[PDB]
Amino acid sequence: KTLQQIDKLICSWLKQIDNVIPQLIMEMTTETKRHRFDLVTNVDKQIQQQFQQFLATYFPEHQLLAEEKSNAMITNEINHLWIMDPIDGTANLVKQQEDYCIILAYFYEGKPMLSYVYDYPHKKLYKAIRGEGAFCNGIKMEEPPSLKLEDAIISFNAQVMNLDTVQDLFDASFSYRLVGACGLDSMRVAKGQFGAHINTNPKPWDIAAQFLFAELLNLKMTTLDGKAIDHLKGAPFIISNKACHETVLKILNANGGYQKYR
Amino acid sequence: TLQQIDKLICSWLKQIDNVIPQLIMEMTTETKRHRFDLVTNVDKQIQQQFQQFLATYFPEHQLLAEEKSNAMITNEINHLWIMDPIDGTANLVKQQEDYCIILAYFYEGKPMLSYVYDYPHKKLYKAIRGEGAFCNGIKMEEPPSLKLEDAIISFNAQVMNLDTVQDLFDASFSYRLVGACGLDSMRVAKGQFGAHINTNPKPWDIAAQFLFAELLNLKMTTLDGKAIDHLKGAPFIISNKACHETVLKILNANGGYQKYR
Ligand SMILES: [Mg+2]
Ligand SMILES: [Mg+2]
Ligand SMILES: [Mg+2]
Ligand SMILES: [Mg+2]
């Protein structure tokens, strides 16, 4: 199989989920996990099951690393690895029915080859294909214009950060917005609408697709130390326009750094 | 009937839909009071064109609007339209997304028609005294009750004290921000958010919301619980009914929400 061929299969499968999701929204059940605000719905689980049955049924060699199942499951060493957040932004799904997505990323011998962020509520499928480029619904994306921090909007979670560094990021930037799903706030950076998105504790599925978007669109995607991220393991991370990446990291690691307690 | 006036407004909106591309094509950006206070040709032309519409079809009606001078009398005026030609100009210029047109009509002080048009996503929220509130025709209903602890909230955390920001985070389900008063308010009308706060809105930022709040059974007041005068700003909130008091309580507590540094 060629990559365009695999993409044809995956797009096709993502598109056919437009048919299923409404039914699941209509019969939505909710459980908690690590605490009462750590939600998981019937929608998350059904989308994951169906992808795994789809993977089993076309790429039986390939593995799945995904949020709503256990994963061991090794480096890398796994020739063909899929990583999935069946619903990124479950809270938003639950509370708003909007601003959530589906994340998939394909890795061959550890190198990222295909990435998808599907903004279902707005029927906007973002994908990235190595050798072809990045697209939103077939409309090819290009590297965004340079944005300095003071000219850019930033997105991050202000509840899990020391309020001093929160303030500094407000002061240093043009404005603050939050969509509330890593894949969506990440896409706003890829489109050039936000200068940078931060998440101080993502799981691997929250950021798996963004790797290839960052590469093909000359974005910086690093740890909050400016280091490479290991796609199997999470790390605190940033996805940024090139002209403001250094400035945001400088601000975050300043004065003892960015955690509550420093 | 306002049904009639509504058809005409809707038809003006359709016409503006065909116009905005051209305006973007030749977009031009200036700043007003500071580097963060933007205006573009899109703002100016949309406004000028409603002014023309109104001079054509309703010559006794008056217009209070962001991009022009306004005097223009408090009380004592029978047909008044309030306009924010683009609400979320920062979003337009920075994101080309999440901005709206805000338009509302007031007959002897009373809300009769209101319009929040989310052009980017082709969604028109309207409200019509006697008929109801609509989103592209689908009738909007009063949203379910939302206690604060089960609700997402939206506000500008930069303009506020960081102790009351925290206390607001502590008491709600989560925090989001769209960045246009029109759209953050419509999230509340839809029950996606429990409340939205703006501490220093202009009349045009909040003018459409009065009529939505009334018909959908929301609360809309100052940050002291009072009636808002539609002709002048005031620090304001629009809230699901089941979280209004709690939010106001938290905002006024420990000496208030205002910056101290
Ligand atoms: Mg989760
Ligand atoms: Mg998830
Ligand atoms: Mg303005
Ligand atoms: Mg405006």
Side-chain angles (χ1 to χ4, degrees), chain A residues 1-33 35 37-76 78-262, chain B residues 1-32 34 36-261:
Chain A
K1 268 159 203 310
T2 69
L3 277 179
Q4 1 300 113
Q5 234 141 206
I6 298 170
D7 188 60
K8 218 270 172 77
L9 272 346
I10 301 281
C11 277
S12 186
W13 182 90
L14 254 9
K15 179 160 142 143
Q16 86 171 215
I17 249 157
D18 296 314
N19 296 319
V20 178
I21 285 183
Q23 191 54 72
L24 305 171
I25 303 290
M26 253 38 77
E27 72 189 11
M28 192 166 90
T29 107
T30 289
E31 296 212 323
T32 55
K33 294 204 287 188
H35 56 96
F37 291 95
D38 184 30
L39 272 34
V40 66
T41 75
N42 65 129
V43 187
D44 310 69
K45 286 179 142 174
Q46 265 295 117
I47 288 172
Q48 206 182 91
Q49 157 184 107
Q50 280 171 238
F51 187 64
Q52 180 148 212
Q53 190 59 285
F54 166 102
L55 223 58
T57 213
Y58 310 70
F59 308 90
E61 288 290 323
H62 297 203
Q63 305 299 107
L64 184 61
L65 165 44
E67 179 177 356
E68 326 291 347
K69 69 184 211 58
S70 66
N71 306 114
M73 205 292 296
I74 55 164
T75 19
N76 204 236
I78 306 238
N79 296 145
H80 296 277
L81 180 61
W82 287 88
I83 307 186
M84 188 184 206
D85 193 335
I87 282 283
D88 191 46
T90 305
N92 273 347
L93 159 76
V94 158
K95 295 290 163 166
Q96 313 195 252
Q97 270 130 303
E98 201 178 337
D99 298 333
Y100 62 88
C101 58
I102 311 187
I103 307 181
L104 286 157
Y106 171 56
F107 297 83
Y108 171 67
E109 285 187 353
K111 190 180 191 193
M113 297 290 136
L114 298 169
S115 293
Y116 307 81
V117 179
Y118 187 27
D119 175 355
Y120 166 72
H122 288 95
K123 271 76 30 180
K124 277 190 193 166
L125 175 52
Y126 300 90
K127 62 191 191 187
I129 301 139
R130 166 164 252 117
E132 294 306 306
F135 307 80
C136 182
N137 289 333
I139 303 196
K140 191 164 206 276
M141 293 170 75
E142 301 298 347
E143 154 172 19
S146 268
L147 292 170
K148 289 155 164 179
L149 188 49
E150 76 225 67
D151 301 307
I153 296 184
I154 36 167
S155 152
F156 61 92
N157 182 346
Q159 322 194 225
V160 55
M161 265 192 207
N162 149 43
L163 252 32
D164 246 59
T165 149
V166 179
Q167 185 63 241
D168 296 331
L169 294 162
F170 290 164
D171 294 334
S173 57
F174 189 89
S175 210
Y176 172 85
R177 308 276 108 118
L178 188 59
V179 174
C182 189
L184 294 178
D185 294 275
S186 290
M187 290 301 106
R188 302 263 190 146
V189 176
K191 279 181 273 163
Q193 311 174 281
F194 285 176
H197 173 65
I198 307 148
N199 185 320
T200 70
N201 188 200
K203 304 271 162 39
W205 45 80
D206 296 311
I207 55 160
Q210 286 86 322
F211 282 101
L212 180 56
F213 285 103
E215 230 187 292
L216 300 188
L217 303 169
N218 204 40
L219 314 165
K220 307 299 178 189
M221 169 170 162
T222 73
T223 64
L224 302 179
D225 281 335
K227 266 96 100 83
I229 301 165
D230 174 24
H231 74 277
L232 269 15
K233 219 283 196 281
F237 110 122
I238 182 165
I239 182 168
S240 194
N241 192 278
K242 60 178 180 176
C244 60
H245 169 82
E246 215 190 12
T247 303
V248 176
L249 287 179
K250 181 173 58 55
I251 291 175
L252 289 161
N253 298 292
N255 305 318
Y258 66 79
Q259 333 256 3
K260 326 291 255 280
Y261 310 139
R262 80 232 255 224
Chain B
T1 53
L2 306 161
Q3 329 274 106
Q4 228 74 258
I5 296 187
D6 181 61
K7 277 151 83 54
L8 267 47
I9 290 290
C10 288
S11 126
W12 185 76
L13 254 19
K14 257 68 225 114
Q15 101 101 323
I16 232 68
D17 216 52
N18 282 341
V19 149
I20 292 161
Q22 318 186 104
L23 301 168
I24 301 295
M25 193 172 73
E26 22 217 342
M27 185 150 72
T28 219
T29 294
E30 340 284 88
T31 55
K32 298 200 287 190
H34 40 88
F36 308 91
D37 187 20
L38 273 29
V39 64
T40 77
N41 68 137
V42 187
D43 306 67
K44 277 158 172 172
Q45 281 298 128
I46 290 171
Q47 185 178 126
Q48 162 172 59
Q49 278 192 228
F50 196 67
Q51 186 137 221
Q52 165 94 21
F53 176 74
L54 218 62
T56 286
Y57 287 113
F58 300 107
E60 278 175 14
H61 293 211
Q62 281 169 16
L63 181 65
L64 163 40
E66 191 175 352
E67 311 316 346
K68 59 184 207 74
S69 159
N70 296 120
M72 227 310 299
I73 43 178
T74 59
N75 31 280
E76 283 287 281
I77 150 164
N78 294 166
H79 304 258
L80 170 60
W81 288 84
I82 303 182
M83 183 178 230
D84 200 335
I86 295 295
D87 189 56
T89 308
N91 284 346
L92 158 58
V93 171
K94 295 290 156 167
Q95 300 200 262
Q96 280 156 352
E97 195 166 345
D98 292 345
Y99 55 84
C100 53
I101 312 182
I102 306 191
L103 232 209
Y105 168 53
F106 289 98
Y107 180 59
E108 315 169 304
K110 196 202 223 193
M112 309 293 189
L113 301 171
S114 297
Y115 299 98
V116 176
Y117 188 40
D118 181 339
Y119 173 81
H121 297 147
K122 280 115 88 196
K123 281 162 207 186
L124 169 78
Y125 302 93
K126 66 176 154 171
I128 302 154
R129 169 142 284 127
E131 272 296 334
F134 298 87
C135 173
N136 290 339
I138 228 167
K139 198 163 216 307
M140 301 177 75
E141 294 288 313
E142 176 185 344
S145 284
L146 300 168
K147 300 144 172 196
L148 186 51
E149 57 276 9
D150 308 312
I152 289 174
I153 54 177
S154 140
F155 57 87
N156 184 347
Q158 308 198 209
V159 89
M160 267 191 219
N161 186 68
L162 268 33
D163 316 290
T164 129
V165 174
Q166 180 62 225
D167 287 335
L168 281 163
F169 287 172
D170 283 350
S172 59
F173 178 90
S174 207
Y175 169 75
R176 305 279 105 108
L177 181 62
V178 184
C181 185
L183 298 186
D184 286 282
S185 308
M186 281 309 99
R187 299 242 178 163
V188 172
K190 287 182 272 159
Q192 302 173 282
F193 289 169
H196 173 63
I197 301 133
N198 185 331
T199 61
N200 211 128
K202 288 287 130 58
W204 48 80
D205 292 310
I206 61 156
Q209 293 91 316
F210 290 103
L211 186 49
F212 287 94
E214 179 164 350
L215 300 191
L216 295 182
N217 195 28
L218 315 175
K219 304 284 170 138
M220 181 168 163
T221 67
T222 66
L223 299 188
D224 306 325
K226 272 79 191 79
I228 306 148
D229 178 15
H230 73 292
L231 265 8
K232 279 290 210 296
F236 112 114
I237 177 176
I238 179 161
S239 198
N240 186 280
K241 82 204 182 169
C243 58
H244 182 62
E245 297 306 334
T246 302
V247 171
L248 284 185
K249 187 151 51 66
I250 285 173
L251 288 168
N252 290 317
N254 320 300
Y257 58 87
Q258 284 286 11
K259 287 286 212 43
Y260 58 100
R261 90 188 324 270

